[PDB]
Design a protein around this ligand. Sequence first.
Ligand SMILES: [Fe+3]
Length: 154
Amino acid sequence: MELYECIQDIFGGLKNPSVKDLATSLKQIPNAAKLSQPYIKEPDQYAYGRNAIYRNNELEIIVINIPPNKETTVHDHGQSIGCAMVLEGKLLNSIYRSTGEHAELSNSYFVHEGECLISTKGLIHKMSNPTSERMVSLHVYSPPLEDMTVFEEQ
Ligand SMILES: [Fe+3]
Protein backbone atom coordinates (compact mmCIF):
# COMPACT_ATOMS: atom_id res chain seq x y z
CA MET A 1 0.00 0.00 0.00
CA GLU A 2 0.98 3.68 0.37
CA LEU A 3 2.25 5.74 3.34
CA TYR A 4 -0.39 8.50 3.62
CA GLU A 5 -3.12 5.91 3.09
CA CYS A 6 -1.56 4.01 5.98
CA ILE A 7 -1.12 7.09 8.14
CA GLN A 8 -4.76 8.21 7.80
CA ASP A 9 -5.83 4.63 8.50
CA ILE A 10 -3.76 4.13 11.63
CA PHE A 11 -3.22 7.59 13.13
CA GLY A 12 -6.13 9.67 11.89
CA GLY A 13 -8.61 8.63 14.56
CA LEU A 14 -6.36 8.69 17.61
CA LYS A 15 -7.58 10.94 20.39
CA ASN A 16 -5.24 11.64 23.32
CA PRO A 17 -3.00 8.66 22.58
CA SER A 18 -0.45 7.50 25.14
CA VAL A 19 3.18 6.87 24.19
CA LYS A 20 2.14 3.24 24.27
CA ASP A 21 -0.59 3.86 21.65
CA LEU A 22 1.86 5.71 19.42
CA ALA A 23 4.46 2.93 19.58
CA THR A 24 1.83 0.35 18.83
CA SER A 25 0.63 2.48 15.90
CA LEU A 26 4.09 2.85 14.39
CA LYS A 27 4.67 -0.92 14.55
CA GLN A 28 1.45 -1.29 12.54
CA ILE A 29 2.87 0.40 9.46
CA PRO A 30 3.75 -2.33 6.96
CA ASN A 31 7.14 -1.80 5.29
CA ALA A 32 7.58 1.50 7.08
CA ALA A 33 11.12 1.85 5.75
CA LYS A 34 10.09 1.27 2.13
CA LEU A 35 7.00 3.47 2.44
CA SER A 36 8.96 6.34 3.98
CA GLN A 37 11.75 6.47 1.42
CA PRO A 38 10.36 9.25 -0.75
CA TYR A 39 10.05 11.44 2.37
CA ILE A 40 13.62 11.15 3.60
CA LYS A 41 15.26 14.59 3.43
CA GLU A 42 18.88 15.73 3.77
CA PRO A 43 20.10 18.17 6.45
CA ASP A 44 19.00 21.78 5.82
CA GLN A 45 18.56 23.91 8.95
CA TYR A 46 19.76 21.13 11.21
CA ALA A 47 22.67 18.73 11.32
CA TYR A 48 20.05 16.14 10.47
CA GLY A 49 17.39 15.88 7.81
CA ARG A 50 13.89 16.51 9.07
CA ASN A 51 10.62 16.25 7.19
CA ALA A 52 7.18 16.87 8.65
CA ILE A 53 4.79 14.82 6.59
CA TYR A 54 1.54 14.76 8.55
CA ARG A 55 -0.27 16.82 11.14
CA ASN A 56 -3.75 17.14 12.64
CA ASN A 57 -4.80 18.67 15.96
CA GLU A 58 -3.78 15.53 17.93
CA LEU A 59 -0.44 14.58 16.48
CA GLU A 60 2.39 15.20 14.08
CA ILE A 61 4.55 12.77 12.09
CA ILE A 62 8.13 13.63 11.13
CA VAL A 63 10.79 11.81 9.11
CA ILE A 64 14.26 12.14 10.54
CA ASN A 65 17.60 11.35 8.95
CA ILE A 66 20.71 11.59 11.08
CA PRO A 67 23.98 11.31 9.17
CA PRO A 68 27.03 9.48 10.61
CA ASN A 69 28.29 11.12 13.84
CA LYS A 70 25.60 13.76 13.85
CA GLU A 71 23.19 14.45 16.70
CA THR A 72 20.24 16.52 17.84
CA THR A 73 20.37 19.13 20.53
CA VAL A 74 19.71 18.21 24.13
CA HIS A 75 16.04 19.07 24.31
CA ASP A 76 12.60 18.30 25.68
CA HIS A 77 9.43 18.29 23.62
CA GLY A 78 7.50 20.96 25.48
CA GLN A 79 4.03 19.80 26.40
CA SER A 80 4.21 16.88 23.99
CA ILE A 81 4.89 13.20 24.29
CA GLY A 82 6.87 11.50 21.57
CA CYS A 83 7.52 8.15 20.02
CA ALA A 84 10.00 7.20 17.33
CA MET A 85 10.58 4.03 15.36
CA VAL A 86 13.91 3.37 13.70
CA LEU A 87 13.39 2.67 9.98
CA GLU A 88 17.01 2.21 9.08
CA GLY A 89 20.31 1.94 10.96
CA LYS A 90 20.84 2.46 14.68
CA LEU A 91 20.66 5.43 17.06
CA LEU A 92 21.87 6.12 20.58
CA ASN A 93 19.23 7.79 22.78
CA SER A 94 20.66 9.73 25.71
CA ILE A 95 18.53 10.82 28.69
CA TYR A 96 19.07 13.87 30.88
CA ARG A 97 17.92 15.29 34.21
CA SER A 98 17.71 19.06 34.74
CA THR A 99 20.58 20.22 36.93
CA GLY A 100 19.04 23.68 37.14
CA GLU A 101 19.53 25.92 34.11
CA HIS A 102 21.48 22.99 32.63
CA ALA A 103 21.15 19.22 32.18
CA GLU A 104 23.33 16.23 33.15
CA LEU A 105 23.48 12.89 31.32
CA SER A 106 21.38 10.33 33.21
CA ASN A 107 20.89 7.37 30.88
CA SER A 108 21.70 6.09 27.39
CA TYR A 109 20.71 3.16 25.17
CA PHE A 110 20.49 2.00 21.57
CA VAL A 111 17.40 1.70 19.45
CA HIS A 112 17.77 -0.62 16.50
CA GLU A 113 15.72 -1.02 13.33
CA GLY A 114 12.07 -1.78 14.06
CA GLU A 115 12.44 -0.79 17.71
CA CYS A 116 10.79 2.22 19.32
CA LEU A 117 11.98 5.01 21.56
CA ILE A 118 9.57 6.73 23.92
CA SER A 119 9.52 10.33 25.11
CA THR A 120 7.26 10.96 28.06
CA LYS A 121 6.32 14.51 28.99
CA GLY A 122 9.17 16.72 30.20
CA LEU A 123 11.72 14.05 29.25
CA ILE A 124 15.03 15.60 28.20
CA HIS A 125 17.03 13.72 25.59
CA LYS A 126 19.39 13.72 22.63
CA MET A 127 19.43 11.35 19.69
CA SER A 128 22.76 10.67 18.06
CA ASN A 129 24.27 8.42 15.42
CA PRO A 130 27.57 6.91 16.57
CA THR A 131 27.58 4.54 13.54
CA SER A 132 29.15 4.83 10.10
CA GLU A 133 25.77 4.77 8.30
CA ARG A 134 22.80 7.12 8.32
CA MET A 135 19.93 6.55 10.69
CA VAL A 136 16.38 7.12 9.57
CA SER A 137 13.50 7.26 12.01
CA LEU A 138 9.79 7.91 11.95
CA HIS A 139 8.70 10.25 14.75
CA VAL A 140 5.27 11.02 16.17
CA TYR A 141 4.54 13.80 18.66
CA SER A 142 1.27 14.51 20.46
CA PRO A 143 0.19 17.32 20.66
CA PRO A 144 2.18 18.56 17.65
CA LEU A 145 5.48 20.12 18.68
CA GLU A 146 5.26 23.76 19.61
CA ASP A 147 7.99 25.02 21.92
CA MET A 148 11.09 22.82 22.19
CA THR A 149 13.37 23.70 25.12
CA VAL A 150 17.09 23.25 24.40
CA PHE A 151 19.54 22.68 27.27
CA GLU A 152 23.29 23.28 27.63
CA GLU A 153 25.48 20.35 28.73
CA GLN A 154 27.15 19.97 32.14
FE1 LIG B 1 13.47 14.91 20.54
